[PDB]
Design an enzyme around this catalytic site. Structure first.
Site, PDB file in Angstrom:
ATOM      1  CG  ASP A 132      -2.129   1.009   1.228  1.00  0.00           C
ATOM      2  OD1 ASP A 132      -2.415   1.284   2.337  1.00  0.00           O
ATOM      3  OD2 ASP A 132      -2.573   1.405   0.297  1.00  0.00           O
ATOM      4  NE  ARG A 136      -4.005   5.023   0.578  1.00  0.00           N
ATOM      5  CZ  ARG A 136      -4.107   4.704  -0.680  1.00  0.00           C
ATOM      6  NH1 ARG A 136      -3.939   5.683  -1.610  1.00  0.00           N
ATOM      7  NH2 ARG A 136      -3.703   3.473  -0.993  1.00  0.00           N
ATOM      8  CG  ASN A 137      -0.488   4.633   3.523  1.00  0.00           C
ATOM      9  OD1 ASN A 137      -1.407   4.855   4.253  1.00  0.00           O
ATOM     10  ND2 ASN A 137      -0.589   3.566   2.785  1.00  0.00           N
ATOM     11  CG  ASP A 150      -1.424   3.163   7.625  1.00  0.00           C
ATOM     12  OD1 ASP A 150      -1.313   2.273   6.956  1.00  0.00           O
ATOM     13  OD2 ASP A 150      -2.056   3.855   8.558  1.00  0.00           O
TER      14      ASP A 150
HETATM   15  C1  LIG Z   1      -2.314   9.813   8.571  1.00  0.00           C
HETATM   16  C2  LIG Z   1      -2.794  10.161  10.115  1.00  0.00           C
HETATM   17  C3  LIG Z   1      -4.314   9.860   9.938  1.00  0.00           C
HETATM   18  C4  LIG Z   1      -2.854  11.705  10.320  1.00  0.00           C
HETATM   19  C5  LIG Z   1      -2.139   9.273  10.802  1.00  0.00           C
HETATM   20  C6  LIG Z   1      -1.478   8.599  11.706  1.00  0.00           C
HETATM   21  C7  LIG Z   1      -0.608   8.039  12.859  1.00  0.00           C
HETATM   22  C8  LIG Z   1       0.680   8.711  13.250  1.00  0.00           C
HETATM   23  C9  LIG Z   1       1.689   8.087  13.820  1.00  0.00           C
HETATM   24  N1  LIG Z   1       2.234   9.519  13.911  1.00  0.00           N
HETATM   25  C10 LIG Z   1       2.062  10.671  13.601  1.00  0.00           C
HETATM   26  N2  LIG Z   1       2.086  11.825  13.477  1.00  0.00           N
HETATM   27  C11 LIG Z   1       1.090  12.549  13.135  1.00  0.00           C
HETATM   28  S1  LIG Z   1      -0.017  11.614  12.660  1.00  0.00           S
HETATM   29  C12 LIG Z   1       0.599  10.099  13.254  1.00  0.00           C
END
Ligand SMILES: CC(C)(C)C#CCc1c[nH]c2ncsc12
Ligand SMILES: CC(C)(C)C#CCc1c[nH]c2ncsc12
Lengths: 256, 258
Positions: A132, A136-137, A150
């Protein structure tokens, strides 16, 4: 590792994940002074099936140690279930590129592509397939630092063999990486906007590819085109991509 | 910027082993200055990006400092094999130096080395830098009358403050505890603390109030200073400004006696 809830102070909502809101907060451990962290929440984790899916991302993430991969800090496995991770203060890459569209130099865009290629070369060295890869990740730690964030169908990013045969391999990750590089150079614009998912495969089959982004160096677009070879065996591996992106970045820095 | 062209470095013999790999001596041919003898830190596992980041962070740390008793950063080679080019201290590692010169070094020389290290540590304290690994193994000998703190790469349980062992807490106060251990090592002519004692048994002894004994020929005033470094309560430990002032007075008293 398991964290006591009393050691976490839940702060402001900073985003919305697939399982629920993501917050910033503070982790107070005896080791380090009070640390700003990200907290992933899970709206429906009372359901064991949902909880298993949510917590599987934490299990996956704990296996990695790389400067461009977000770190797992810990988990809280009692309801409400939370994943504690490293905070990337500048947030999601797409929003960051859209907001900074006219303030980020080309050298910064190429640097982000390079940094992600180093995280992916690391994953490739561990025989890990992401499945993936997409802007966006990716999270933004600083103006000069991005991280794969992610590890939790996206027809428009997928390699043709993934769509056609559900085959996900190191080669299909390279195709997706090519799409992610296009998204970065397009300042967070999604691929094939307005095109139906079912028409995407047909265009790809016909030899059509995402066009060269404005201001994208021809050498970098040539690299994206190699990621998108229909035959997965003709796609480069991340060692070559990392080396080529480093040369491209140095050429851009020298130009400016 | 501190990047150096590899062609300007001639790698010589291995002179020691660091946390990341072998250390060599070599020659740096700078564009303007004469050929200079240098030390070259190598990194065995720098193919791993996490290891490479840690190795190069030591050079970025060293780049921040400029003190007569801190080894100078000369430059870096960021391409594989990654190298850190630094000032060469010809007499080598402090422990080996003290062991070999055990019957030829006067007490005034031992106190001088403790004083010089306290000046480098007072300087690091003025920059709010926490070392976390103060030990005689991290000290180099530039001349018979000059020692320098030589490593900034960083478990050293036998040197650690109780809060560092118990809670992984590292502060300016925990550095003072480690400095007290380093002073003991100097006065013991390079003997390691708690020889034969298992690392896991260290915390238990500290908590029973046990401390490293007074080295033979150590002035009672200097051992009293080591005992202040080893206060269980971190807030009761002196800061390096006071340590530097007290060591200077002790060194002058020894010189006057001689
Ligand atoms: C993309 C989104 C939904 C903001 C997310 C997430 C998980 C995360 C891990 N570390 C971190 N820092 C800012 S958002 C996030
Ligand atoms: C810095 C560290 C790892 C303690 C070492 C070493 C070996 C060595 C001998 N002489 C010398 N000069 C500069 S480093 C070094």
């Amino acid at each position: 590792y398991e964290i006591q809830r009393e050691r976490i102070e839940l702060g402001r909502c900073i985003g919305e994940g697939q399982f629920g809101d993501v917050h910033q907060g503070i982790y107070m451990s005896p080791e380090n002074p009070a640390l700003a962290v990200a907290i992933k929440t899970c709206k429906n984790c009372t359901s064991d099936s949902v909880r298993e899916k949510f917590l599987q991302e934490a299990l996956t993430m704990r296996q990695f140690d790389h400067p461009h991969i977000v770190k797992l800090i810990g988990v809280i496995t009692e309801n409400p279930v939370w994943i504690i991770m490293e905070l990337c203060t500048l947030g999601e890459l797409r929003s960051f590129l859209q907001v900074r569209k006219y303030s980020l130099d080309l050298a910064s865009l190429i640097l982000y592509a390079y940094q992600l290629s180093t995280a992916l070369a690391y994953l490739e060295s561990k025989r890990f397939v992401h499945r993936d890869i997409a802007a966006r990740n990716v999270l933004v730690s600083s103006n000069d630092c991005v991280k794969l964030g992610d590890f939790g169908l996206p027809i428009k990013w997928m390699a043709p063999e993934s769509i056609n045969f559900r085959r996900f391999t190191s080669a299909s990750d390279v195709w997706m990486f090519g799409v992610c590089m296009w998204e970065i150079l397009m300042h967070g614009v999604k691929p094939f906007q307005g095109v139906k998912n079912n028409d995407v495969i047909g265009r790809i089959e016909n030899g059509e590819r995402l066009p060269m982004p404005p201001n994208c160096p021809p050498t970098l677009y040539s690299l994206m085109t190699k990621c998108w070879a229909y035959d997965p065996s003709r796609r480069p591996r991340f060692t070559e991509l990392k080396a080529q992106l480093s040369t491209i970045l140095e050429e851009e820095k020298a130009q400016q």
